Amino acid sequence: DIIIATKNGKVRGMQLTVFGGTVTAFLGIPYAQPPLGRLRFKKPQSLTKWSDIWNATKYANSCCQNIDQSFPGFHGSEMWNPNTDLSEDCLYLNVWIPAPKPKNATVLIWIYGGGFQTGTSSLHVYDGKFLARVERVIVVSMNYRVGALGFLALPGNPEAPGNMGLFDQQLALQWVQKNIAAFGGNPKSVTLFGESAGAASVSLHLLSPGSHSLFTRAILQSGSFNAPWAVTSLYEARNRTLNLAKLTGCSRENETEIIKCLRNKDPQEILLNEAFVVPYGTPLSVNFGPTVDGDFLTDMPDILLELGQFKKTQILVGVNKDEGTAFLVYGAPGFSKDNNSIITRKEFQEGLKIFFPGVSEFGKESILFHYTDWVDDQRPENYREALGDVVGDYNFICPALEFTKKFSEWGNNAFFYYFEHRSSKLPWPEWMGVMHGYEIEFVFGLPLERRDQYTKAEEILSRSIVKRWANFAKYGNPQETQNQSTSWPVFKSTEQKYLTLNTESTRIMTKLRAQQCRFWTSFFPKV
Ligand SMILES: *[C@@H]1O[C@H](CO[C@@H]2O[C@@H](C)[C@@H](O)[C@@H](O)[C@@H]2O)[C@@H](O[C@@H]2O[C@H](CO)[C@@H](O)[C@H](O)[C@H]2NC(C)=O)[C@H](O)[C@H]1NC(C)=O
Ligand SMILES: *[C@@H]1O[C@H](CO[C@@H]2O[C@@H](C)[C@@H](O)[C@@H](O)[C@@H]2O)[C@@H](O[C@@H]2O[C@H](CO)[C@@H](O)[C@H](O)[C@H]2NC(C)=O)[C@H](O)[C@H]1NC(C)=O
Ligand SMILES: *[C@@H]1O[C@H](CO[C@@H]2O[C@@H](C)[C@@H](O)[C@@H](O)[C@@H]2O)[C@@H](O)[C@H](O)[C@H]1NC(C)=O
Ligand SMILES: *[C@@H]1O[C@H](CO[C@@H]2O[C@@H](C)[C@@H](O)[C@@H](O)[C@@H]2O)[C@@H](O)[C@H](O)[C@H]1NC(C)=O
Ligand SMILES: *[C@@H]1O[C@H](CO[C@@H]2O[C@@H](C)[C@@H](O)[C@@H](O)[C@@H]2O)[C@@H](O)[C@H](O)[C@H]1NC(C)=O
Ligand SMILES: CNc1cccc2c(CN(C)CCC3CCCCCC3)c[nH]c12
Ligand SMILES: *[C@@H]1O[C@H](CO)[C@@H](O)[C@H](O)[C@H]1NC(C)=O
Secondary structure, eight states, X not given: OOEEEETTEEEEOEEEEETTEEEEEEEEEEOSOOOOGGGTTSOOOOOOOOSSEEEOBSOOOEEOOOOXXXXXXXXXXHTTSOSSOEESOOOEEEEEEESSOOSSEEEEEEEOOSTTTOOOTTOGGGOTHHHHHHHOOEEEEEOOOOHHHHHOBOTTOTTSBXXXXXXXXXXXXXXXXXXXXXXXXXXXXXXXXXXXXXXXHHHHHHHOGGGGGGOSEEEEESOOTTSTTTOBOHHHHHHHHHHHHHHHTOOOSSHHHHHHHHHTSOHHHHHXXXXXXXXXXXXXXOSSOOBOOSSSOOSOHHHHHHTTOSOOSOEEEEEETBTTHHHHTTTOTTOOTTSOOOOOHHHHHHHHHHHSTTSOHHHHHHHHHHHOOOSOTTOTTHHHHHHHHHHHIIIIIHHHHHHHHHHHTTTOOEEEEEEOOOXXXXXXXXXXXXXXTTTHHHHTTGGGXXXXXXXXXXXXXXXXXXXXXXXXXXXXXXXXXXXXXXXXXXXXXXXXXXXXXXXXOOOEEESTTHHHHHHHHHTGGGO
16 A cells, blocks of 8 residues: 655555556646636636545546547547546646665656647656556656636736636646655656647746746657637637637626636537637637737747747657658648648648638748649649648657757757657558657557567567656666667757667658748748
């Protein structure tokens, strides 16, 4: 029986057998008052002490969210859907600690992605037991509010100030600072890591003064706040809140009366109307996400980044070879996970309308012009691959590279990777390549489980990645120093070296997507 006295009371864990060893898991520790009733849309309130032994022996409720029903029964989509009951009572976190209890272990804190509208810490691919077992780090993950329940914003109004799900994350980091030493963890050695919206979240914790003392280092997988989907402007956020109000029958003149009306609505009424608060959405629509609230985020984050107003520390950033392909089968015409999705020029043009709905004609032709100068006009997958690259470069790769350039210009060590291995168990079709989200299982070390049908090459790739991530967390340097590995050089804004991650040859390259990102970073913002 493993009991730990936290500062709010004793929690009971459970023992896991992992790789002929043991990991102690505390699943579902509450870290905030449940944000129900008068607390919906507010910042998370601090938790009150209990005197019993809280049983942390099961993942807790996932936060309310809409579920992907686009491919019922398909593991490629349903593996991302919540695997615990949805509930507004969802402000819980998880801790995996090595057995025997470490003395001063480095802590990894996972922040999941999902477009700020979906996600949960209990997903199989976020299971921290392999990292704890193999690298003897402590892994922490938390649920945070998503959608309107996490990011509804009437900025300046404390009944719905915005960024609540970001403050959820923050309160959880605070929990680690106050409590993790009782678990054998070192609160002075905490590394945040996250993917997609989780990575965008990590990047905003680097920018938020209230988070600066709650962590040491940061890892950003396939995301950053300067991604075009990641921050909502004050204007859109207000228009979206008001539109939600009209759709629910909550239109009032007194802004507070609107929030109170929205507080007596059932979560499903709010979730159902979430998709229509914008006139033209895209498969990448983030209807309710981070905004400039003057609290978590004191200014437009592009300005903070450009002018060096962020935590000075090391970062590890990277992207996957085919970030954009996954979103093509959520709306682009002629695309399907069940055929090879050879699309025509006209379908490509139609696809640009789907992904760039409010962009001028000239802007859309400028995308076409820069992505359709063919090395071979007759290749039939030319247009199919261009659309994936357009979506992937615009939404993920170029913002991540731009974030890393700007961050490193202020003197900090930064390390950039390009993940280009397609999982041998990937249930999506081959034309979608190295998809968004499918490095996560390698980072969490699922291929180290021999029973799990991964190849031997994949076990070795995950082992090296797991070591690099742990070495970055512990020491600020993502090297694998023992097995004659390629040395990972720091990313500098002049030479922009990065490391490729694949089962064959791990290589040093320079200036990822140079031509494509000059278009997205220095042309397209002007259209
Ligand atoms: C700001 O919001 C208005 C209102 O949006 C409409 O009403 C909401 C309650 C919701 O149901 C939306 O889906 C509606 O579109 C937007 O105004 C609409 O704009 C479209 C196209 O521009 C037009 O066809 C509709 O008739 C407009 N509806 C109304 C009531 O004016 C407006 O576009 C939003 N602003 C931005 C920049 O997106
Ligand atoms: C690839 O599939 C898409 C999707 O169509 C559906 O899925 C198919 C696998 C099959 O089950 C079809 O019966 C379904 O309609 C095809 O896109 C459709 O194409 C037709 C004619 O080309 C068009 O009228 C529809 O509007 C398209 N629907 C969508 C959602 O785009 C596509 O043509 C297929 N391409 C190839 C190369 O096979
Ligand atoms: C908390 O857990 C106590 C310890 O029992 C352990 O957990 C239960 C769920 C069983 O799996 C048992 O075999 C374990 O040893 C329980 O006695 C207690 O009832 C639990 N408290 C609450 C409120 O559920
Ligand atoms: C735990 O270690 C503390 C020092 O932490 C050091 O600095 C941070 C930045 C990490 O990178 C970590 O690897 C370093 O060891 C001590 O100050 C503290 O007293 C120690 N406490 C215990 C109980 O061992
Ligand atoms: C390192 O490699 C181990 C197996 O490879 C063996 O060890 C190295 C040092 C060489 O001698 C090689 O020829 C041997 O076959 C793995 O078991 C281990 O997990 C690897 N470690 C990391 C961090 O990747
Ligand atoms: C930027 N992020 C993002 C934005 C908007 C929506 C989502 C979703 C939810 N739905 C709409 C798409 C799911 C796909 C994600 C990519 C991994 C394979 C599964 C398909 C996940 N991220 C999102
Ligand atoms: C809205 O009504 C509330 C009463 O709950 C009041 O406290 C607030 O000042 C009012 N705001 C405006 C703008 O009238």
